[PDB]
Symmetry: C2
Subunit: 219 residues, 2 copies
């Protein structure tokens, strides 16, 4: 397919996007981040394939960055396809404990590190992880980047180009709006929200997601 | 997945819709028609799977209709997945000659009947087939239903919910707008346009498709 794209979206923050080209629909995209702490790089969600993960690692190496770890924000392949490769390179991989268990239940490679806590931090205080409750999946977490004022909402949040919730096979639709409201309750001074699929937007992605969740739940 | 849906959209015309549920995106739909001439039924595009084709044939049998033939509007699986089943039941299957050759090149079941003509008619004059030129694929054809004033645009036309051309792996983007203009030149008194994917709309689907094609071609 179309290979990995990596673009800068803030000082020390890059959006990585990988793709699948589906007959019947067309190109589907999948986003994660690279977050820098000086020269130390943290991967928030792997690309959607092992090959695209290799491209992301090469992207870092070519530019002199040192990849420290990855965190995956739920167990789906579009968040985790690269865990196997990172493990083979002795790069620490993280998920929540529930995500780890879900991966093992799917017969997929597990992270080398995991936490059973609603909050966890990577780097300085560079990346603040939070579990707001079930939505897109039972295990979805989000990441707040206090320096850049970016919330990585992952697949729990929906870009404005979408008029529905996306893939809901593993979703808890009746809990989804409440889980977004829990994010809102954190009172992050959000300047940008990055979704797992679709275009980056502003804080109103949260409101849009609540609208979509409440509509689908009442249906 | 979610099984076949069949709903009436005009006197003697039914929309059949089949689905695939994709992680990373969600539910993708695929449309065809059943067109009646008294009790004689014509299938414009098969459902997206053999199993959904069996459901469509059962739908017809249960309601007393006699399925006479199918026509597929290009070679992609979402138009043709049911050809094998119809052939096994000695129900005539049609495509254009180019579509037939493309199917054989993909190692897929071929229709039992085919024409190398820009126009062809099924039933009364019930269904008027036209090849307007390359767009979504090299072989795409459309169907005009003069009694119901419906143009089945198939995957060559794009519903208003889409802001792009969809799957373009086999497309001729530089010819697409011209091909729509050829449809316009037929001067069909169009009341409804049915796309291969997405929601049924009005004649302005043609204009929308031209806009999308011209934008993509200039890019
Ligand atoms: Zn997911
Ligand atoms: Zn996702
Ligand atoms: Zn097609
Ligand atoms: Zn199609």
């Amino acid at each position: 397919h179309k290979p990995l794209e990596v673009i800068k979206i803030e000082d020390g923050v890059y959006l990585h996007t990988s793709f699948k080209n589906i007959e019947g629909y067309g190109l589907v995209d999948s986003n994660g981040l690279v977050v820098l702490d000086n020269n130390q790089a943290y991967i928030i969600d792997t690309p959607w394939s092992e090959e695209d993960t290799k491209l992301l690692l090469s992207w870092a190496t070519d530019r002199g960055y040192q990849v420290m770890a990855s965190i995956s924000t739920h167990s789906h392949e579009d968040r985790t396809a690269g865990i196997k490769l990172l493990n083979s390179k002795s790069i620490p991989t993280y998920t929540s404990e529930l995500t780890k268990k879900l991966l093992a239940r799917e017969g997929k490679p597990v992270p080398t590190h995991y936490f059973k806590d609603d909050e966890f931090t990577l780097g300085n205080g560079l990346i603040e992880l939070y579990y707001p409750g079930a939505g897109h999946t039972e295990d979805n977490i989000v990441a707040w980047l206090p320096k850049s004022k970016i919330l990585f909402g992952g697949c729990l949040v929906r870009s404005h180009e979408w008029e529905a919730l996306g893939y809901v096979g593993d979703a808890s639709i009746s809990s989804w709006a409440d889980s977004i409201k829990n994010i809102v309750s954190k009172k992050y001074p959000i300047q940008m929200v990055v979704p797992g699929h679709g275009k980056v937007g502003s804080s109103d992605i949260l409101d849009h997601t609540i609208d979509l969740a409440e509509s689908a739940s009442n249906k």
